Amino acid sequence: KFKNSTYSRSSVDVLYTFANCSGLDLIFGLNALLRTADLQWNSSNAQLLLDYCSSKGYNISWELGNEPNSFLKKADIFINGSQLGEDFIQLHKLLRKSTFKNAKLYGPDVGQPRRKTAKMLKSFLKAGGEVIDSVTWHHYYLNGRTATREDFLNPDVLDIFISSVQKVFQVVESTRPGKKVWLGETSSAYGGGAPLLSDTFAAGFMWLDKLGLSARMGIEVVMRQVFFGAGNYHLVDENFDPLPDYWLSLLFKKLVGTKVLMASVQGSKRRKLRVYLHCTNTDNPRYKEGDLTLYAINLHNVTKYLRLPYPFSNKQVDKYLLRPLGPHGLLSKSVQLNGLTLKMVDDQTLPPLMEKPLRPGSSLGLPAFSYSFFVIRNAKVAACI
Amino acid sequence: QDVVDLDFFTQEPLHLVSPSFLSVTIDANLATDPRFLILLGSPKLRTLARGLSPAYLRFGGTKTDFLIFDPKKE
Ligand SMILES: *[C@@H]1[C@H](O)[C@@H](O)[C@H](O[C@H]2O[C@H](COS(=O)(=O)O)[C@@H](O)[C@H](O)[C@H]2NC(C)=O)[C@@H](C(=O)O)[C@H]1O
Ligand SMILES: *[C@@H]1O[C@H](CO[C@@H]2O[C@@H](C)[C@@H](O)[C@@H](O)[C@@H]2O)[C@@H](O)[C@H](O)[C@H]1NC(C)=O
Ligand SMILES: *[C@@H]1O[C@H](CO)[C@@H](O)[C@H](O)[C@H]1NC(C)=O
Ligand SMILES: *[C@@H]1O[C@H](CO)[C@@H](O)[C@H](O)[C@H]1NC(C)=O
Ligand SMILES: *[C@@H]1O[C@H](CO)[C@@H](O)[C@H](O)[C@H]1NC(C)=O
Ligand SMILES: [Cl-]
Numbered sequence: 001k002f003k004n005s006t007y008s009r010s011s012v013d014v015l016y017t018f019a020n021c022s023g024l025d026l027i028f029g030l031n032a033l034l035r036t037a038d039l040q041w042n043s044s045n046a047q048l049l050l051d052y053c054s055s056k057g058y059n060i061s062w063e064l065g066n067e068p069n070s071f072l073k074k075a076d077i078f079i080n081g082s083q084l085g086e087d088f089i090q091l092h093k094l095l096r097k098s099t100f101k102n103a104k105l106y107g108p109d110v111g112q113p114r115r116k117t118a119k120m121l122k123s124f125l126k127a128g129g130e131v132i133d134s135v136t137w138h139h140y141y142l143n144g145r146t147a148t149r150e151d152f153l154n155p156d157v158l159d160i161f162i163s164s165v166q167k168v169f170q171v172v173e174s175t176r177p178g179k180k181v182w183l184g185e186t187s188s189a190y191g192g193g194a195p196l197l198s199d200t201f202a203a204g205f206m207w208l209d210k211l212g213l214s215a216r217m218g219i220e221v222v223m224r225q226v227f228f229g230a231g232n233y234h235l236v237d238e239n240f241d242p243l244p245d246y247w248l249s250l251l252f253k254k255l256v257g258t259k260v261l262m263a264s265v266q267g268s269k270r271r272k273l274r275v276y277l278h279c280t281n282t283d284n285p286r287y288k289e290g291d292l293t294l295y296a297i298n299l300h301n302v303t304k305y306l307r308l309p310y311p312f313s314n315k316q317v318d319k320y321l322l323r324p325l326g327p328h329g330l331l332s333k334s335v336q337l338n339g340l341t342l343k344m345v346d347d348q349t350l351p352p353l354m355e356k357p358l359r360p361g362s363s364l365g366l367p368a369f370s371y372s373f374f375v376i377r378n379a380k381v382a383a384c385i
Numbered sequence: 386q387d388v389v390d391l392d393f394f395t396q397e398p399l400h401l402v403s404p405s406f407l408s409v410t411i412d413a414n415l416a417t418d419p420r421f422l423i424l425l426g427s428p429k430l431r432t433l434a435r436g437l438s439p440a441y442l443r444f445g446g447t448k449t450d451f452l453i454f455d456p457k458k459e
Contacts, residue, residue, distance in 0.1 A: 002448070002450075002451045003451065005416075005451060006452075006454070006455035006458050007416050007453075007454060007455070007458070008458035009456060010422065010458075011416050011421060014422045014425045014426070015411070018411075018425035018426075018430075018434070021431055022434030022435050022442070023434075023435055023438030023440075024409075024437075024438060024439075024440050025405065025440070025442065026444060027442065027444065028444050029413060029449035031450050031452055031453065034453075045453055045454050046454075048454050048456055052454070061441075063449070065450055066413070066445050066446060066447060066450055067447070074447065074450065075450065075451075109445065184443060184445070185410055185443065185445065185446075211407060214402075214406075215402050215406065216399070218400050219402075220400075220401075220402055220403050220406070221405055221408050222408060223408040223409060223410050223441060223443045224407070224408065225410050225412070227410065227411055227434065227442070228411065228430060229411060229412045229414070229415045230414060230415070231412075235409065240427050240430045242433055246433065246436075249407055250436050252407055253407055253436075253437060256406075258402050258403070258404055258406070259401060260398060260399050260400040260401070261393065261394055261395055261398065262399060263391055263393055263394075265389050265391060266390040266391070266392055267389070275391060277393055277395075304388075304389050305388045306391055307389070307390050308391060308393075309391060309393055312393070344429075344432070347428055347429040347432060348428065350432065350433075350436050363388060384395075
């Protein structure tokens with residue numbers, strides 16, 4: 001049911017200007033269904049775009065195709081992973097002959113690793129893995145059409161992501177050991193998201209858990225479907241107003257560093273209380289080398305009280321607890337940080353994200369169905385340099 | 386009693402994520418919206434986008450494989 005559309009130099013410039021002015025690094029997906037007689041990739045349209053982008057001095061990274069595992073369903077064309085690998089080798093040759101000869105190339109943007117997708121990924125990495133800078137794959141927990149509120153709160157649903165990640169690394173370790181692995185498109189639910197769920201506070205359990213697990217398990221980059229657009233998994237709605245996952249994303253960015261550590265809860269029950277630990281983001285002007293950022297999800301229906309281990313038990317902790325603004329509870333599209341509603345100051349001005357210092361040596365309170373960050377000040381962790 | 390003890394591993398980094406670890410998409414299909422220029426030119430939207438820098442912006446989606454560059458189109 002999908003039809004070809006054209007796009008203009010204008011559309012390219014709109015896209016590039018938006019990325020450049022926002023401090024984002026653009027990755028442009030090229031059309032992989034442009035084929036020759038013998039089902040080789042026909043690169044002639046890509047050549048026109050590479051030439052235009054070159055002429056404008058655009059610093060752009062490239063992909064080729066989206067979920068090639070479903071090409072037969074979408075376009076009645078089957079491309080096997082071997083051929084797709086060869087297609088990527090042809091794109092790599094074009095990039096090498098372009099003005100940006102060191103441009104990065106990512107792919108193949110396969111869906112999650114069902115048997116047929118795992119096979120396509122393996123044959124793609126055998127054939128084409130030498131020319132890609134990172135392996136991209138996609139993940140969704142649920143079908144947006146059928147997802148329920150209980151699904152969004154169910155640790156058995158959250159835990160399925162662990163097996164997807166293990167299956168992708170099994171394929172990569174067998175073919176291109178040590179190649180970086182990226183989530184190239186990911187959200188709560190596919191088909192544009194779960195109405196009244198994917199755009200709410202309740203979406204944040206899946207998003208924060210995905211980020212925690214991705215970092216813990218060796219995924220280097222997670223690309224959230226979608227910043228803005230059709231489908232209520234957007235971070236920003238049709239009025240350009242931020243939803244709870246935008247605020248969660250911003251707080252994650254301000255507090256959580258690049259060095260991943262590990263946290264776990266003593267006792268046999270690790271399902272409903274979910275904990276993650278990184279070095280604190282060093283760019284945060286409040287904090288200093290050696291500080292830790294803990295983040296936690298409470299899917300229990302009662303408050304839990306977390307005790308930090310020696311030698312962190314008596315440190316100053318800053319709390320950053322997210323709760324919904326009423327009256328719609330977890331189905332709210334508004335969130336409070338430490339009891340203050342998060343809202344733009346104006347169209348040009350994000351608000352401060354204000355910490356709540358806890359009394360040194362107090363347990364960390366995490367209300368039912370909430371998530372929070374906790375910065376451990378003067379943690380002096382050598383690993384965090 | 387609802388109290389829970391945490392264990393921390395702090396010896397060394399287990400992994401290093403990109404500074405751009407939390408990245409975002411714009412779906413290829415948005416380029417088929419007549420208002421694409423108005424939407425991505427929105428100062429309010431750009432303020433929110435700048436808030437998540439540094440990040441990758443993946444321009445891609447199902448429509449990736451149904452889009453053709455036409456250098457003559459206005
Ligand atoms: C990832 C795909 O790459 C992505 O395009 C897709 O999201 C888009 O397509 C969805 C399916 O539409 S249709 O029924 O095939 O016509 C659509 O429901 C979404 O609205 C659309 N998203 C945007 C932001 O334009 C997602 C998905 O949500 O299914 C993944 O398949
Ligand atoms: C609340 O949740 C119960 C199961 O969770 C367990 O019991 C509660 C009190 C907490 O101690 C939690 O840490 C435990 O894991 C359910 O059996 C019970 O029905 C729930 N109550 C209601 C009315 O929703
Ligand atoms: C899209 O166009 C290409 C070449 O111009 C063609 O091979 C293909 O059949 C078209 N696809 C659809 C769905 O019309
Ligand atoms: C690739 O596509 C272009 C434009 O659609 C066509 O004219 C060209 O000859 C094609 N190349 C092959 C080898 O099919
Ligand atoms: C993959 O596809 C090509 C045709 O596009 C074919 O020649 C080749 O044998 C196929 N490879 C396998 C492993 O079937
Ligand atoms: Cl295959």
